[PDB]
Amino acid sequence: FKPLESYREDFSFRNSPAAIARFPFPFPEDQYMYSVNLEPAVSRDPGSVFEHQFDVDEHYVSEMAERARVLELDPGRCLVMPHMAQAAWDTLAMLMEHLARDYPQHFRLTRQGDAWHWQNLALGIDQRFTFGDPASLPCEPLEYITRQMQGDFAVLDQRDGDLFMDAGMVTCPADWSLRFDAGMSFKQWHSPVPMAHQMGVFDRALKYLLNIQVGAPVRRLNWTLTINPRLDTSPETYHEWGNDRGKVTPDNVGRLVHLRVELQLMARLPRSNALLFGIRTYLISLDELVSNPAWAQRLHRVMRDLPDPIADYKGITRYRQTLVDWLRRFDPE
Numbered sequence: 001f002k003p004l005e006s007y008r009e010d011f012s013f014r015n016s017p018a019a020i021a022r023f024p025f026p027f028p029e030d031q032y033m034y035s036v037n038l039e040p041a042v043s044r045d046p047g048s049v050f051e052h053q054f055d056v057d058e059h060y061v062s063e064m065a066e067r068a069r070v071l072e073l074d075p076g077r078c079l080v081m082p083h084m085a086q087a088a089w090d091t092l093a094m095l096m097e098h099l100a101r102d103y104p105q106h107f108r109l110t111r112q113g114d115a116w117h118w119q120n121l122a123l124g125i126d127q128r129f130t131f132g133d134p135a136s137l138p139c140e141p142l143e144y145i146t147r148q149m150q151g152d153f154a155v156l157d158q159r160d161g162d163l164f165m166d167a168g169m170v171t172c173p174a175d176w177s178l179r180f181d182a183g184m185s186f187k188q189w190h191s192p193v194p195m196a197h198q199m200g201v202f203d204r205a206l207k208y209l210l211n212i213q214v215g216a217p218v219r220r221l222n223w224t225l226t227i228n229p230r231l232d233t234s235p236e237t238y239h240e241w242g243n244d245r246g247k248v249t250p251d252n253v254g255r256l257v258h259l260r261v262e263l264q265l266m267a268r269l270p271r272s273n274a275l276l277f278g279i280r281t282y283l284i285s286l287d288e289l290v291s292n293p294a295w296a297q298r299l300h301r302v303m304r305d306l307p308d309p310i311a312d313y314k315g316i317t318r319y320r321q322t323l324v325d326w327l328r329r330f331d332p333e
């Protein structure tokens with residue numbers, strides 16, 4: 001873990017060369033289109049973001065500080081409807097188990113029955129508590145554990161042939177809000193997305209997700225762009241970030257425009273039968289990205305050719321031409 005970085009204000013976040021090398025570049029082709037891009041979330045490629053179910057990286061402490069600031073300002077970024085309390089404990093069990101197995105240098109868990117002892121050495125936390133007893137922890141169980149893992153989480157109730165957004169911790173969204181979406185069903189919360197409904201992507205995806213079983217989790221990548229390494233690109237805080245989309249120039253694209261990738265996990269939670277949706281968010285500046293000339297060339301092509309409704313949906317419209325012109329320099333054809 002490097003020195004504390006910000007994702008707001010002075011934007012001190014930056015990637016080491018190792019963090020650049022493992023960035024999850026999301027484009028298998030020189031153009032992008034929506035699809036059901038799901039695969040089994042099996043461990044692969046040691047050192048990569050796909051090695052473990054939950055990826056903890058160099059920015060862990062910085063990010064947890066960012067989460068804490070968001071929640072200090074707005075505790076309503078975390079919501080757990082009462083029927084989802086068991087699912088919140090399932091989520092805390094899954095995260096603590098995997099973190100302690102995969103990063104034993106940073107996390108430890110020992111248990112006897114419902115007497116659990118969790119240590120997070122990175123954050124100086126040493127907690128003895130009662131699994132299932134929310135008065136035993138300093139806050140509600142989903143908030144407790146997600147204050148200690150990178151990325152956002154939604155917890156979906158599966159009922160009546162659908163998924164319902166009935167709990168979550170959403171502090172680094174790509175321009176959406178859990179308080180807006182609370183209680184919505186799968187196709188409903190997806191209503192603003194262009195193209196993909198008519199394509200069948202959401203029908204097919206819902207069907208795959210409803211069939212997810214314990215021990216066979218699934219993953220996909222999503223992406224967008226963000227100006228500055230701003231994690232909290234929420235409706236709630238628009239006045240703090242939306243203006244930056246007018247600040248891109250030919251001279252500053254490389255330092256301002258960031259590629260944002262979401263490594264998404266869908267995992268069945270074993271007591272409750274709920275579905276955990278992890279949204280692990282990676283950021284890389286274009287100066288960093290173009291370190292890799294194959295990434296640079298491919299991003300030029302993607303951005304030049306991206307369907308306008310998809311560009312508009314992603315919020316790239318205002319700076320897209322400047323961006324495209326800048327990236328063209330890295331594309332020998």
Ligand code: HEM
Pocket residue numbers: 034035036037154156163165175176181189190192193196201205209220222223224277313314
């Ligand atoms: C339960 C699991 C999922 C949750 C909770 C979730 C949630 C969301 C939310 C809240 C948005 C933003 C909508 C907005 O603009 O207000 C979104 C966008 C999107 N979702 Fe999902 N989603 C899930 C699963 C999937 C799956 C399996 C696919 C498969 C393709 C998918 C594809 C998309 C697409 C294509 C967009 C537009 C993203 C972009 O263009 O950057 N989602 N999702």
Ligand code: NA
Pocket residue numbers: 035
């Ligand atoms: Na294809």
